[PDB]
Amino acid sequence: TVHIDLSALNPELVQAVQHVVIGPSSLIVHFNEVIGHFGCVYHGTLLDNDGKKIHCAVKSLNRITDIGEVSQFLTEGIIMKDFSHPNVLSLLGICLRSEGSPLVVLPYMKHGDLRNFIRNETHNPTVKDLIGFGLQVAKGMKYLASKKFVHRDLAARNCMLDEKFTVKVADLPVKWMALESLQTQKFTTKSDVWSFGVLLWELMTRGAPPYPDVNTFDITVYLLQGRRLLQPEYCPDPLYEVMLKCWHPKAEMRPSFSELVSRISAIFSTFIGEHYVH
Amino acid sequence: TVHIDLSALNPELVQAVQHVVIGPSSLIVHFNEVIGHFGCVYHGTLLDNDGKKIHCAVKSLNRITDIGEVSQFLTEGIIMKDFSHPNVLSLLGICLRSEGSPLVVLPYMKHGDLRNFIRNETHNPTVKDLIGFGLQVAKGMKYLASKKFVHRDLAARNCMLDEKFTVKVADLPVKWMALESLQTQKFTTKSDVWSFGVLLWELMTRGAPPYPDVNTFDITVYLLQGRRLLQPEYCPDPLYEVMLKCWHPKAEMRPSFSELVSRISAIFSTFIGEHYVH
Ligand SMILES: COc1ccc2c(Oc3ccc(NC(=O)c4c(C)n(CC(C)(C)O)n(-c5ccccc5)c4=O)cc3F)ccnc2c1
Ligand SMILES: COc1ccc2c(Oc3ccc(NC(=O)c4c(C)n(CC(C)(C)O)n(-c5ccccc5)c4=O)cc3F)ccnc2c1
């Protein structure tokens, strides 16, 4: 029952978004074929001018009803389309339709999200593999921070993994949130750094749920008492130290993603044995 | 301590927003002179090319820190700038600065917000006057609904009043929210219609607080029990009937703003005696 009045949109903005729009001249959506946790996502195929096919995921934004939301949707499209880094999920385009919800078009990620990948017992990542995934996320966050983009929901579940095992950073979650975000409601690159530390912990435990024994409403006190996620069984000491610095109570004292890439890269090189080479 | 990196913004969007941007070649902000409830708002003066001055209000968006928020701010600017109706507050422009928070520039409204105006005992609006204010708001909402814009926070406090006593619709509030908004979290033009009915009630009581004896967390049950705001002492029966229809439990059965303008206009014409002629 979604019929959006596209004539109601502003002309200057529609002009700005043209370079992001893709349509039925290029994209086949398979509305009968679902990609099963990230909303309503369909299999799609994107053709260039000679008819070459690219497998994509096509997400239907079924909440977007009004022209404010559609205008915000267009803006998010313009922003994301500019980003170009091998560790940040690409936006292939968006669809602005007069019938049906707006669509977002992403490259197909063969191995799904990182959390489900590492939890799957049939996969056998080494400690080096898991640290490597962490380093890839750091590089993507370094790029995004360089663009002044604040992630706000960084977590293993929001990182994707392609057929070459390249981690693509993509996309309430109190157990990932910085202390200051929990109380002042505000998010920064420094709070993304805190979430990154929790993501590293997720990696080293192969997707264990963090703080299993603390209620979500008792997390602020736990953290103020100076308590932190315990060092995972497979996590080496130098990596656990990096995690602890990511959870510094003073956001200003946390390392930058640039600092993290450098440190983690040094740790990764001392490790040997990999089953998932990038 | 606000230093936003404007080079980080997208080129196509910056091009789209140019027609909304105003700068130091036209605008004098009096940062030492405050307009005292709507955030940080300063007196400003806007000059055209021959040096003619227009009194404005200049609001400093001190929350806007990151490029996502700035991009969303630009989009809101583009949308609002298109709106042109005598009962909707105009956007004179926005300021995108490399130092200091983004600014929004609005025409100065001599008589402030409608709620404070009607509560001020030194003003003497008649029943016709109050209904007239209500009709003006309805006309503004009719325009906005025609543009597919959903208000979400319609209330007497968010309507402004200029020197000619023209009401300008401008800008959590559970006692104004539709039943369905309270439970499904979603907002529509039909939920704006519900808030409009509460605004009419505010008008007819000269800014009394609604549902004085019900806690904000008991409002959903109160409404589900079929209870409604009582008919104000000065509210005529036909207007109270309009209010009741605005609070129909079925959003689809509520009148349109177009229907409201027509009905309220008929009621207003049967009234005589005014101190605030539009
Ligand atoms: C094989 O299993 C899967 C499972 C899910 C897959 C998959 O899921 C998604 C993964 C990510 C996303 N979307 C995002 O990451 C989005 C991002 C980062 N943005 C931008 C922003 C963060 C600013 O909102 N948006 C977005 C973009 C434009 C308009 C609106 C939202 C998005 O939709 C949407 C998805 F459907 C993509 C590709 N392959 C997959 C493969
Ligand atoms: C004499 O006393 C006063 C007191 C307040 C006054 C006054 O207060 C304001 C009244 C309204 C507003 N702002 C709005 O109504 C805004 C609206 C409707 N928008 C658009 C939207 C609803 C989509 O957010 N915005 C807005 C616009 C551009 C960018 C960001 C937000 C706004 O700032 C800002 C104000 F400072 C304006 C003029 N005269 C006044 C006079």
A to B CB pairs, distance under 8 Å: 73
C-alpha–C-alpha distance, residues A218 and A223, integer Å: 9
Which among A12, A15, A150 has the least Cβ separation from residue B66? A150
Q: Please name the method used to determine this structure.
A: X-ray
Tokens of A227: 């308590």
CB A116 within 8 A of CB A178: no
For chain A, the residues whose C-beta falls within 8 A of a C-beta of chain B are 5, 8, 10, 12-13, 15-17, 19, 65-68, 71-72, 74-75, 78-79, 82, 147-150, 186, 188
Determine if residue B29 is labeled as part of a ligand binding site.
no
Burial A119-146 (b: 16+ CB within 10 A, else e): eeeeeebebbbbbbbbbbbbbbbbbbbe
Tokens of B9: 């913004």
C-alpha A179 – ligand 1 centre gap (Å): 27
Tokens of A94: 């968006």
Tokens of A99: 């019938």
CB A61 within 8 A of CB A103: yes
Cα B55 → chain centroid: 20
Going by alpha carbons, the residue nearest to atom 4 of ligand 1 is: A112
Q: Is B207 left (phi over 0), alpha (psi -120 to 50) or beta?
A: left
Q: What 3-state DSSP class applies to B89?
A: coil
Tokens of B90: 């105009």
User: What residue in B sits closest to A81 (Cα-Cα)?
Assistant: B10
C-alpha–C-alpha distance, residues B244 and B229, integer Å: 9
C-alpha–C-alpha distance, residues A33 and A228, integer Å: 43
CB B85 within 8 A of CB B143: yes
C-alpha–C-alpha distance, residues A226 and A223, integer Å: 5
Resolution expressed in Å: 2.0
CB B175 within 8 A of CB B218: no
B93-95 and B103-107: which strand pairing?
Answer: antiparallel
Selection from A131, A263, A257, A122 nearest residue A196 by Cα = A257
SS3 annotation, chain A: CCCCCHHHCCHHHHHHHHHHECCCCCEEEEEEEECCCCCEEEEEEEECCCCCEEEEEEEECCCCCCHHHHHHHHHHHHHHHHCCCCCECCCCEEECCCCCCCEEEEECCCCCEHHHHHHCCCCCCCHHHHHHHHHHHHHHHHHHHHCCCCCCCCCHHHEEECCCCCEEECCCCHHHCCHHHHHHCCCCHHHHHHHHHHHHHHHHCCCCCCCCCCCHHHHHHHHHCCCCCCCCCCCCHHHHHHHHHHCCCCHHHCCCHHHHHHHHHHHHHCCCCCCCCC
Please answer yes or no on whether A10 and B188 come within 8 Å at the CB atom: no
CB B67 within 8 A of CB A67: no
CB A123 within 8 A of CB A117: yes
Does A169 contact ligand 1 (Cβ within 6 A)?
Answer: no
C-alpha–C-alpha distance, residues B267 and B260, integer Å: 10
CB atoms within 10 A of CB A189: 19
C-alpha–C-alpha distance, residues B57 and B59, integer Å: 6
CB atoms within 10 A of CB B24: 9
Does B106 contact ligand 2 (Cβ within 6 A)?
Answer: yes
Residues of A in contact with B7 (CB under 8 A): none
Q: What domains appear along chain A, each with residue ranges and CATH number?
A: 1-108 (3.30.200.20), 109-278 (1.10.510.10)
Q: What 3-state DSSP class applies to B41?
A: strand
Find residue B104's DSSP bridge partners: B59, B94
Q: What 3-state DSSP class applies to B32?
A: strand
C-alpha–C-alpha distance, residues A207 and A119, integer Å: 5
CB atoms within 10 A of CB B225: 8
CB A92 within 8 A of CB A56: yes
Cα A251 → chain centroid: 21
Tell me the residue ranges of DSSP E strands in chain B.
27-34, 40-47, 53-60, 93-95, 103-107, 159-161, 167-169
